[PDB]
Design a protein around this ligand. Sequence first.
Ligand SMILES: CCC1=C(C)/C(=C/C2=NC(=C\c3[nH]c(/C=C4\NC(=O)[C@H](C)[C@H]4CC)c(C)c3CCC(=O)O)/C(CCC(=O)O)=C2C)NC1=O
Ligand SMILES: CCC1=C(C)/C(=C/C2=NC(=C\c3[nH]c(/C=C4\NC(=O)[C@H](C)[C@H]4CC)c(C)c3CCC(=O)O)/C(CCC(=O)O)=C2C)NC1=O
Ligand SMILES: CCC1=C(C)/C(=C/C2=NC(=C\c3[nH]c(/C=C4\NC(=O)[C@H](C)[C@H]4CC)c(C)c3CCC(=O)O)/C(CCC(=O)O)=C2C)NC1=O
Ligand SMILES: CCC1=C(C)/C(=C/C2=NC(=C\c3[nH]c(/C=C4\NC(=O)[C@H](C)[C@H]4CC)c(C)c3CCC(=O)O)/C(CCC(=O)O)=C2C)NC1=O
Ligand SMILES: CCC1=C(C)/C(=C/C2=NC(=C\c3[nH]c(/C=C4\NC(=O)[C@H](C)[C@H]4CC)c(C)c3CCC(=O)O)/C(CCC(=O)O)=C2C)NC1=O
Ligand SMILES: CCC1=C(C)/C(=C/C2=NC(=C\c3[nH]c(/C=C4\NC(=O)[C@H](C)[C@H]4CC)c(C)c3CCC(=O)O)/C(CCC(=O)O)=C2C)NC1=O
Ligand SMILES: CCC1=C(C)/C(=C/C2=NC(=C\c3[nH]c(/C=C4\NC(=O)[C@H](C)[C@H]4CC)c(C)c3CCC(=O)O)/C(CCC(=O)O)=C2C)NC1=O
Ligand SMILES: CCC1=C(C)/C(=C/C2=NC(=C\c3[nH]c(/C=C4\NC(=O)[C@H](C)[C@H]4CC)c(C)c3CCC(=O)O)/C(CCC(=O)O)=C2C)NC1=O
Ligand SMILES: CCC1=C(C)/C(=C/C2=NC(=C\c3[nH]c(/C=C4\NC(=O)[C@H](C)[C@H]4CC)c(C)c3CCC(=O)O)/C(CCC(=O)O)=C2C)NC1=O
Ligand SMILES: CCC1=C(C)/C(=C/C2=NC(=C\c3[nH]c(/C=C4\NC(=O)[C@H](C)[C@H]4CC)c(C)c3CCC(=O)O)/C(CCC(=O)O)=C2C)NC1=O
Lengths: 162, 160, 160, 160, 159, 159, 159, 159, 172, 98, 65
Amino acid sequence: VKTPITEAIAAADTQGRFLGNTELQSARGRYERAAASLEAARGLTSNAQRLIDGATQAVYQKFPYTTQTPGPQFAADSRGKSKCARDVGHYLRIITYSLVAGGTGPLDEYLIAGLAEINSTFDLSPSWYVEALKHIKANHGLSGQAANEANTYIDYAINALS
Amino acid sequence: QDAITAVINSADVQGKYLDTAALEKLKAYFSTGELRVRAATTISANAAAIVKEAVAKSLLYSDITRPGGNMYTTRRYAACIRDLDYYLRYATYAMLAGDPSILDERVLNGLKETYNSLGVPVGATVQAIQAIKEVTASLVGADAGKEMGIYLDYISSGLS
Amino acid sequence: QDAITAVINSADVQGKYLDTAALEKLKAYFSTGELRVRAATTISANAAAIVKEAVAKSLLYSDITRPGGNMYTTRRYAACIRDLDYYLRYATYAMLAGDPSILDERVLNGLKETYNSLGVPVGATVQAIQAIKEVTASLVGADAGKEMGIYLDYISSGLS
Amino acid sequence: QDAITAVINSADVQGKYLDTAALEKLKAYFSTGELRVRAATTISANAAAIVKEAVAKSLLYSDITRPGGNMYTTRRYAACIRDLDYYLRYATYAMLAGDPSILDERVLNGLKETYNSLGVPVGATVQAIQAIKEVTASLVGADAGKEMGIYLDYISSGLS
Amino acid sequence: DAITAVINSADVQGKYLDTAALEKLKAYFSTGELRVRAATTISANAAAIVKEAVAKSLLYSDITRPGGNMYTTRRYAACIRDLDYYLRYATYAMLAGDPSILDERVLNGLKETYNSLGVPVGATVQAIQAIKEVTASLVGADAGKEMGIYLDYISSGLS
Amino acid sequence: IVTKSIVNADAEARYLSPGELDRIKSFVAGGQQRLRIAQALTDNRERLVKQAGDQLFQKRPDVVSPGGNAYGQEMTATCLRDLDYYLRLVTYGIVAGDVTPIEEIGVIGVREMYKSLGTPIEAVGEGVRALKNAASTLLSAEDAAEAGSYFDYVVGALQ
Amino acid sequence: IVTKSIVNADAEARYLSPGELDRIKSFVAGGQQRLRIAQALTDNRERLVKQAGDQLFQKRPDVVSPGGNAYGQEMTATCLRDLDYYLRLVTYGIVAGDVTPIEEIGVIGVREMYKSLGTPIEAVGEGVRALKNAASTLLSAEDAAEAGSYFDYVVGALQ
Amino acid sequence: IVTKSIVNADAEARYLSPGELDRIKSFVAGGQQRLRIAQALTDNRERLVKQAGDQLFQKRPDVVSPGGNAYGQEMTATCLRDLDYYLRLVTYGIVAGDVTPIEEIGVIGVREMYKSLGTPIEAVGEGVRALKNAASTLLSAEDAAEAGSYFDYVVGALQ
Amino acid sequence: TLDVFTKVVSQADSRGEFLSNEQLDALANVVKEGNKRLDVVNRITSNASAIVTNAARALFEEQPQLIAPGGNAYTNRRMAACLRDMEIILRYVTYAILAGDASVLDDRCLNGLRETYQALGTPGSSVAVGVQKMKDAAVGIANDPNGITKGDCSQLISEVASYFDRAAAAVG
Amino acid sequence: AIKTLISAAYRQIFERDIAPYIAQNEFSGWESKLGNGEITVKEFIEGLGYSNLYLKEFYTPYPNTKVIELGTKHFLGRAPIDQAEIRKYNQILATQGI
Amino acid sequence: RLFKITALVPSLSRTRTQRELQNTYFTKLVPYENWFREQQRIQKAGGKIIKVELATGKQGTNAGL
Ligand SMILES: CCC1=C(C)/C(=C/C2=NC(=C\c3[nH]c(/C=C4\NC(=O)[C@H](C)[C@H]4CC)c(C)c3CCC(=O)O)/C(CCC(=O)O)=C2C)NC1=O
Ligand SMILES: CCC1=C(C)/C(=C/C2=NC(=C\c3[nH]c(/C=C4\NC(=O)[C@H](C)[C@H]4CC)c(C)c3CCC(=O)O)/C(CCC(=O)O)=C2C)NC1=O
Ligand SMILES: CCC1=C(C)/C(=C/C2=NC(=C\c3[nH]c(/C=C4\NC(=O)[C@H](C)[C@H]4CC)c(C)c3CCC(=O)O)/C(CCC(=O)O)=C2C)NC1=O
Ligand SMILES: CCC1=C(C)/C(=C/C2=NC(=C\c3[nH]c(/C=C4\NC(=O)[C@H](C)[C@H]4CC)c(C)c3CCC(=O)O)/C(CCC(=O)O)=C2C)NC1=O
Ligand SMILES: CCC1=C(C)/C(=C/C2=NC(=C\c3[nH]c(/C=C4\NC(=O)[C@H](C)[C@H]4CC)c(C)c3CCC(=O)O)/C(CCC(=O)O)=C2C)NC1=O
Ligand SMILES: CCC1=C(C)/C(=C/C2=NC(=C\c3[nH]c(/C=C4\NC(=O)[C@H](C)[C@H]4CC)c(C)c3CCC(=O)O)/C(CCC(=O)O)=C2C)NC1=O
Ligand SMILES: CCC1=C(C)/C(=C/C2=NC(=C\c3[nH]c(/C=C4\NC(=O)[C@H](C)[C@H]4CC)c(C)c3CCC(=O)O)/C(CCC(=O)O)=C2C)NC1=O
Ligand SMILES: CCC1=C(C)/C(=C/C2=NC(=C\c3[nH]c(/C=C4\NC(=O)[C@H](C)[C@H]4CC)c(C)c3CCC(=O)O)/C(CCC(=O)O)=C2C)NC1=O
Ligand SMILES: CCC1=C(C)/C(=C/C2=NC(=C\c3[nH]c(/C=C4\NC(=O)[C@H](C)[C@H]4CC)c(C)c3CCC(=O)O)/C(CCC(=O)O)=C2C)NC1=O
Ligand SMILES: CCC1=C(C)/C(=C/C2=NC(=C\c3[nH]c(/C=C4\NC(=O)[C@H](C)[C@H]4CC)c(C)c3CCC(=O)O)/C(CCC(=O)O)=C2C)NC1=O
């Protein structure tokens, strides 16, 4: 799992040398933005049920296909729509994890590590999630600087999808 | 009463003119009135959804709606919905006034007398007002949900 | 009061002598006193086991003994055991007297006032007295368990 | 209760451990305890002088100490001094505890009942507690006089 | 206390607390630290101390057999509570640094009480000595003998 | 400890005597060390319950044995939950500085509760002793002394 | 029943009642049958005590578990001696008609005693219940009701 | 503070609390500074008493008025001796940490005494307040807080 | 490798729910305390070689069998290996100081470390003597105020004494 | 009978058993002096009120007038007669302890 | 601190059919504070006081009782 503190560790450990001043400034930088990212963390957990059910409906509006045709892949049945809030409910968790971790670490392992191999099997089209996140990108309602850094991890998961 | 009317009254009973602390209080009220009005609008939007979600959180599928409970009869269920709508509406009025005196004057006056006369359970009412407070603090945001929860907790504390 | 003392009182307030119906009542009491005494002895045997089995049946592993419940604090658990021992002991006294007046005079007098003052849950108490009644009706037999359950259900009905 | 005991109770009834907000509350109490103890010492110094100055400010040379007033009889003057000493002493206890619950539990419980039973004037008592508050806020300083006046105004507000 | 004893001795003299009394007070403070630590470690396992003492001294004898003073169940419980007392009041007299409170508390009437009830004295002295050994093994050397001074004061007052 | 002095001076008609004000000022001074000790016991709770269950079930295997109470996963989970409760009350007593808010919730009626639950109280006392040993290993010397204070109170209370 | 009747009429200022004299007459009339029951229980001392103790160890294996109190030959011999003592007190109570011999020899302070001995109360009580069942199987039927009801007093008073 | 802690734990059935043992430890740690304050007040006996008495006669000239009590050389010498007595009791209370030496030597029955002597209470109290101000000016600052708070107890308890 | 930021993640991931605002406020100490972490490691590694060579004279002060002939720290290769391992603990300690949680030190320094002393013959319990003879010099260098403005790092300092106490206890 | 009378005064002053309600027994000295008969029952009842458990039960959660009525209910067995009877007890709870 | 008293108090009211043998003749330990008024009660009831003894206290103790 990646963290700008643990990047200062593993780069110092493979060299076999101590923690010089050139790794302490790496952790120094995270502290400056640590306060900033947490304001984006409180902005998302307060809007948990608002963003999920807003973005889940935002998929069905642009894609009326997945609500109609029968199949285990789509969400014509309620168990599809129940698993709809499973995925996008799990998407906003790791985005809130990646902001509190300060890095792309938990977003790397938990979400995008094997994501290109599941979607080839279960017929989950990645264009579904990539525009689910675009609704979260626009409707999180954050402002200031934390609106940019919460926007950073969203379109990092987009480039992993596409 | 208002927060404005309370400030004017506190300056009046001394015979004092409006000094700078009272002007600070009035200017703080005139700063907070923006989110006060926006919160009152979105609470007036979906009050029935808030009451429905609150009874689904706290009171439903208990023994209270079972026979023997106080919400078994359907007129008693309708009276329960009426009382929760009253608590939410008067908390909206106290939030927009910025002063809890209307809760003391119109709701909390003889209410424990009535609820001990009818045999209404008080703790279930307190938990229902708590569920109301959680639902509207989720719905309106944290920043106005604090002021909504202050007057809802005022009703809950005076009820107990 | 007794069943004997109740029969004597009902004959006294009329100025009536002891007619044959009162003698029938007293002779029925003198017939049933055998199993009354035997039931009171075996209930006095293992009252602590009955209370332990009753809380293990009804109250344990619920939310009541969890934090937030009314039996969370250990002094409140001890007060719960005390109240259940009171219910069983006074039900034993009312069973041996054959008249529920001592329950009305010593237990059920101001008890709902106390339980609504302290916030004690009433339905869980009723359930606990029900579990007491099932355990002692199993322990004593059906024939004396009927008379034990009559006074325990009297306590449960007056409590509600 | 304390401020410490209130924080522990509020953390206990949720089953919550001591989170950082409760530790902030306890550390603020441990910061303010210095001036709390110093204020309690100098109020315990000259309580009789404070009560004497308060009756000389508010109650003396009125109609209350004239015949017809409630402080005319000398046992009633002694009872007045006793009540003012009670208000000052329990306000000292509530100041050092940092929690007004002992005022609610020991002073303000059945006090309006007593003062309306005896015919004691309430407004003159409120003005006497106000004069007590002004004298001790002058005597102790502004920084501890604020916390002394909070509990004395609590007694005055609950009395009215 | 030892402090109130120093103050009372100076008060009967009618003078103040100068350097001899002050040095006694400094001595009392220096031993008071380890006295506090010994009070904690005694209040830890007082029940185990009384249990080990009665198991070492009083059990499997003639007094616990039928025809003895400790035969009956209420008499055995009175024995436990009396030894529990002797330990608790020796702890108090250790923390005061002064045995007069201990004397005034129990040695006032326990002689006449054990006379009238027929309680044997020497078995109590043996039990108090067993308490002294158990607490000296449990606490330490110097706090153990500080405890043993007041326990031997109790045992000498009963005799 | 402020409620103790307040009800202590409140039974009397006198004010708070300034020696009590000195002890309140000293407790106010030591409150920061109290808060650090409580947070150190707070964040490391599951280690302490693990090592307490370790040392207890090594010491007394009858709770593990099927005749004992803590037999099976559900009963042993309830056992470690009881040890968690007692560690929580010990942290409360560490912050409060005096054993009133821990005795009010864990001590005052515990014997009849554990008697009508079937569990022995001596095994609970050994569990709190194991908690004291594990916290003594976790803390420094002046911290382990001040934690073993209230742990010692609980161990003496359960017996 | 004579001592209890005399002290009950002693608390009042009056003599013994005709009802109480009927009680003494009926007790005298049943006294010979009570001596027969005491004869049977005296002569069946061994096997009753051993069957009751082994029924106890069948029900409760915690005492003879190595964490338990009755671990070892000597400890289990004292266990059987305790059951012997209680059967002796039951015979005394069957003869007297009162429970004051049972009470003031073996009931009145037994909880504090077995708390200080480390022994569980409920296992004593289960052993006396096993004695009740064994002596109920040995005797005649309503005679066993008589014996088992004094046993029932001992069982309910121990818990 | 040891006597008060012992009698407070005596009113209960339990030992000394860990909180109270912390109180005794902190009192021992501050005891040397308290002996220093007692050293300064012992050595400044003369001028403190004379300055306080003359401050009293500056504030209250009624006592040295010919209608007053302290009229004449002998009466005013006894006035200064009373102030000497109270300063001595203040030093005792500073050393002990309790106010029980101040109380049971000079507080407990002083109102009835000075009522029967014809002496006003408030002038005694004003003289002890003058002693508080003088000893506050002599000592170090928070050391003077310590001395003046015991003086404050004497002043509030006299009125 | 773990952190105080990522153990909170993995504690919340095994629950599988969003982090509460009660949770993040406790984490907001660390972004304030990151001012205090970042120089206490800088204080140790600046004086790293002074700690090692001064504590090389402390285990060798008390136990002179180690340069006795036939000792286990006896020869030059062996004594150079002692200094090779006298500061291999300090980098793994200062990694845990910066990370704030000891999961780096427990899988790289102490994971199976005790096993080799039962394999080689070098005394395990003697290393635990000299390791907590470093921490009185490590804390004593990290605590004293010189130049830096006064602040309370005592709470943070206990952590540093805990990591040496953990590493010494899991060796001997 | 002495054990009965020990539990008796607990029942009269406290309307429950006192032993569920206290950590330690606290009455070992008072029960010892009762069984030896060195003190009478009146001195035992007076000693029951000096204990801090009675203050914790009937004095700290209650105001002064309710403590007057509860104290005369527990010890005297009756409510106070006149207002002057309340006044003298208020003076005694005023300038002195409970 | 504690007095050991022994006193008799006769019955100058009507005669009682219960004993009051503990109440007529008694020996009890009374604290020092209550002893003055309790003595004064026996002074009032016209009873003789036979034996007064200081049980715990020492004479002439100025501090600490
Ligand atoms: C913790 C991070 C995490 C995520 C997000 C995740 C998603 C995930 N979603 C899945 C299936 C699914 N995903 C969806 C979701 C959708 N399909 C639709 O029709 C909608 C367009 C869309 C929701 C907006 C549905 C309906 C299934 C079931 C499809 C099937 O069973 O074939 C599957 C395969 C089967 C499963 O275990 O349920 C995975 C692994 N797994 C993870 O470990
Ligand atoms: C504006 C402030 C205000 C309130 C609150 C108010 C309450 C109120 N609630 C009533 C009944 C009731 N109130 C309740 C309410 C409850 N019982 C429960 O079990 C729940 C805990 C709780 C609902 C959350 C119920 C069930 C009744 C029916 C009793 C009956 O009519 O038979 C009644 C009796 C007559 C009637 O409803 O029309 C009044 C006056 N009046 C007021 O002017
Ligand atoms: C002889 C008839 C009689 C009864 C019943 C009685 C009850 C009684 N129960 C009480 C408290 C209590 N009663 C309960 C009992 C319960 N709460 C629950 O959650 C359960 C449903 C129920 C137990 C089955 C509890 C938990 C308390 C503790 C409240 C407290 O003291 O903080 C109190 C307050 C003071 C005290 O216990 O000592 C009284 C007077 N008094 C009587 O004279
Ligand atoms: C904070 C104050 C507090 C205390 C003290 C407390 C005790 C407590 N212990 C319980 C059970 C239990 N307690 C234990 C105890 C133990 N395991 C053993 O062998 C040892 C003797 C001991 C611990 C090491 C066991 C085995 C049970 C389950 C017993 C059963 O299910 O009958 C229960 C009933 C189940 C429950 O609701 O948790 C309570 C209420 N509860 C509280 O709220
Ligand atoms: C006549 C009234 C009377 C009783 C009841 C009595 C009991 C009694 N039981 C003892 C020990 C013992 N008692 C038991 C008892 C038991 N094992 C269990 O687990 C069961 C619950 C219980 C069997 C009923 C054990 C195991 C010991 C040995 C404990 C030890 O040696 O420390 C001892 C100490 C050693 C001795 O003197 O024998 C006494 C005095 N003494 C009396 O004079
Ligand atoms: C250690 C405790 C203690 C105290 C306090 C004490 C006081 C005390 N003050 C006395 C007289 C006196 N005390 C005063 C006092 C005063 N003049 C004023 O107006 C002022 C208010 C006040 C100075 C503080 C005077 C004027 C007399 C002489 C009165 C007379 O001789 O009748 C006497 C009688 C003569 C004597 O024996 O000295 C006593 C015993 N004795 C004690 O043992
Ligand atoms: C990763 C590279 C890095 C380091 C090393 C670093 C350290 C660092 N420590 C600071 C402050 C400080 N550091 C300390 C530390 C202490 N004072 C004591 O007396 C204690 C003994 C000791 C803690 C044990 C204190 C007290 C301050 C005061 C300012 C503050 O609170 O940050 C600051 C505040 C800003 C400044 O000094 O310019 C810096 C930069 N910042 C960085 O970017
Ligand atoms: C078996 C082969 C072998 C050798 C030779 C050896 C030498 C050796 N000499 C040492 C120190 C030392 N070596 C010397 C020797 C000298 N310093 C001087 O001032 C003189 C110029 C010079 C001697 C002529 C001294 C005085 C010390 C102690 C220095 C210190 O403690 O810092 C040390 C480090 C500490 C020690 O364990 O004592 C080693 C390892 N080690 C080996 O394993
Ligand atoms: C707190 C200071 C204090 C003490 C110590 C005290 C002791 C005391 N011990 C007593 C009895 C007793 N004391 C014992 C003691 C013993 N038997 C032996 O063989 C041993 C030598 C010794 C046990 C180690 C016994 C057996 C009885 C009861 C005798 C009887 O049945 O009358 C009694 C008579 C009432 C009773 O408790 O039953 C008192 C008052 N009272 C106090 O106030
Ligand atoms: C600790 C809280 C507490 C309070 C306050 C309290 C008050 C109290 N005040 C009383 C009387 C009184 N209270 C007052 C007081 C006043 N009347 C006035 O005119 C003034 C406005 C005011 C004084 C500032 C007077 C004059 C009486 C005398 C009535 C009488 O006894 O005839 C009485 C009647 C009996 C008695 O004094 O002894 C009580 C119980 N009791 C308490 O437990």
